Design an enzyme around this catalytic site. Structure first.
Site, PDB file in Angstrom:
ATOM      1  N   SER A 171      38.637 -27.983 -11.596  1.00 33.02           N
ATOM      2  CA  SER A 171      39.502 -28.570 -10.255  1.00 33.02           C
ATOM      3  C   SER A 171      41.128 -27.662 -10.830  1.00 33.02           C
ATOM      4  O   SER A 171      41.116 -26.856 -12.212  1.00 33.02           O
ATOM      5  CB  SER A 171      39.476 -28.861  -8.812  1.00 33.02           C
ATOM      6  OG  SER A 171      40.047 -28.402  -7.930  1.00 33.02           O
ATOM      7  N   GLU A 199      32.325 -20.992  -2.880  1.00 32.93           N
ATOM      8  CA  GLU A 199      33.312 -21.961  -3.219  1.00 32.93           C
ATOM      9  C   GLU A 199      34.144 -21.212  -3.052  1.00 32.93           C
ATOM     10  O   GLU A 199      34.214 -19.705  -3.475  1.00 32.93           O
ATOM     11  CB  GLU A 199      33.490 -23.037  -4.605  1.00 32.93           C
ATOM     12  CG  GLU A 199      33.335 -22.614  -5.363  1.00 32.93           C
ATOM     13  CD  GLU A 199      33.985 -23.249  -6.483  1.00 32.93           C
ATOM     14  OE1 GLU A 199      35.163 -23.968  -6.992  1.00 32.93           O
ATOM     15  OE2 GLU A 199      33.562 -23.804  -8.637  1.00 32.93           O
ATOM     16  N   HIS A 218      32.141 -26.835  -5.555  1.00 32.01           N
ATOM     17  CA  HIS A 218      33.243 -26.750  -5.894  1.00 32.01           C
ATOM     18  C   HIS A 218      32.884 -28.145  -6.426  1.00 32.01           C
ATOM     19  O   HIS A 218      32.647 -29.393  -6.453  1.00 32.01           O
ATOM     20  CB  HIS A 218      34.423 -27.156  -5.278  1.00 32.01           C
ATOM     21  CG  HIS A 218      35.360 -27.449  -5.781  1.00 32.01           C
ATOM     22  ND1 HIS A 218      36.063 -25.956  -6.614  1.00 32.01           N
ATOM     23  CD2 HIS A 218      37.039 -28.409  -5.942  1.00 32.01           C
ATOM     24  CE1 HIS A 218      36.847 -26.756  -7.142  1.00 32.01           C
ATOM     25  NE2 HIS A 218      37.897 -28.026  -6.594  1.00 32.01           N
TER      26      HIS A 218
END
Length: 293
Positions: A143, A234, A264
């Site tokens: 991320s 995502e 994600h």
């Protein structure tokens, strides 16, 4: 679409906070902490301090001595901890047969950009100072932390530090502007305005196209081979498709894998998601591949 993703997707939508409710930071922080999966019980852990931050060495059974992963956790640069990520990193340690250095780098808004980057460059320095050879090193993260991997690589290179053998961004956030098509295109599919507040909190009025904040705008020339994981479903699909193309253009050895139906950092759901485990096995494979080369 396997049964488990279908179910995980339902559970995440069922559990979600309604769209456009604004949850205070310490409330997202406490909830990320409370829901964190426990690491497998054969993961050993040793608390260290590294460039002024708490870290843990995270060793699964079977670690080759002399190998290491600088691991940078997700959480939008505002949240996340050693504790939120011990589980999945323990499994990445299992797969790669290398111990993970799990850094608790400085978070915004208390420590805005470029604090996180300084912590990572310095953690990597620390690793080289301990006598790990760059060729025995890898940097991975998820991320925000996947963007950070890249930001750390660029910053370290500009500072003359040697590149490691490999780097693996998982679902990288590499573009603070959040303007990519996929924010609209993959919106329904993604069970997972909130991301804008993070960028705003992290940047604190910094240029959102600063290379070390938004590495999709950086010169990637000379970075080691990249494995990019991202999910088809995502909002960050585009960050990864553009990262790959920037890397390719910049002369970097990139392999992008868009896993169909995936969300994600689906790696993080490896206890109930077969692809989570599978994607983690493959990160360890690619690390090991790159160390053998």
């Amino acid at each position: 679409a396997g049964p488990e993703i279908v179910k995980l997707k339902k559970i995440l939508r069922e559990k979600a906070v309604p769209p456009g409710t604004e949850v205070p930071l310490d409330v997202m922080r406490k909830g990320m902490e409370k829901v964190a999966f426990k690491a497998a019980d054969d993961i050993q852990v040793e608390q260290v301090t590294v460039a002024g931050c708490a870290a843990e060495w995270v060793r699964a059974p079977g670690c080759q001595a002399g190998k290491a992963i600088l691991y940078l956790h997700g959480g939008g640069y505002v949240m996340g901890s050693i504790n939120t990520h011990r589980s999945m990193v323990g499994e990445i340690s299992r797969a790669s047969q290398a111990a993970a250095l799990l850094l608790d780098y400085r978070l915004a808004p208390e420590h805005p950009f470029p604090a996180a980057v300084e912590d990572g460059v310095a953690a990597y320095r620390w690793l080289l100072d301990q006598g790990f050879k760059p060729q025995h090193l890898s940097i991975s993260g998820d991320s925000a932390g996947g963007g950070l991997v890249l930001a750390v690589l660029v910053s370290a290179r500009d500072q003359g530090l040697p590149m490691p053998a490999s780097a693996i961004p998982i679902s990288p956030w590499a573009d603070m502007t959040c303007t990519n098509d996929s924010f609209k295109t993959r919106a329904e599919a993604d069970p997972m305005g909130g991301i804008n507040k993070m960028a705003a909190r992290y940047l604190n009025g910094a240029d959102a196209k600063h290379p070390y904040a938004s590495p999709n705008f950086a010169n990637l020339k000379g970075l080691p081979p990249l494995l990019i994981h991202v999910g088809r479903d995502e909002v960050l699909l585009d960050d990864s498709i553009k990262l790959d193309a920037k890397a390719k253009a910049d002369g970097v050895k990139s392999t992008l894998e868009i896993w169909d139906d995936m969300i994600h950092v689906w790696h993080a759901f490896h206890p109930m998601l077969p692809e989570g485990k599978q994607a983690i096995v493959r990160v360890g494979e690619f690390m090991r591949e790159q160390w053998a080369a």
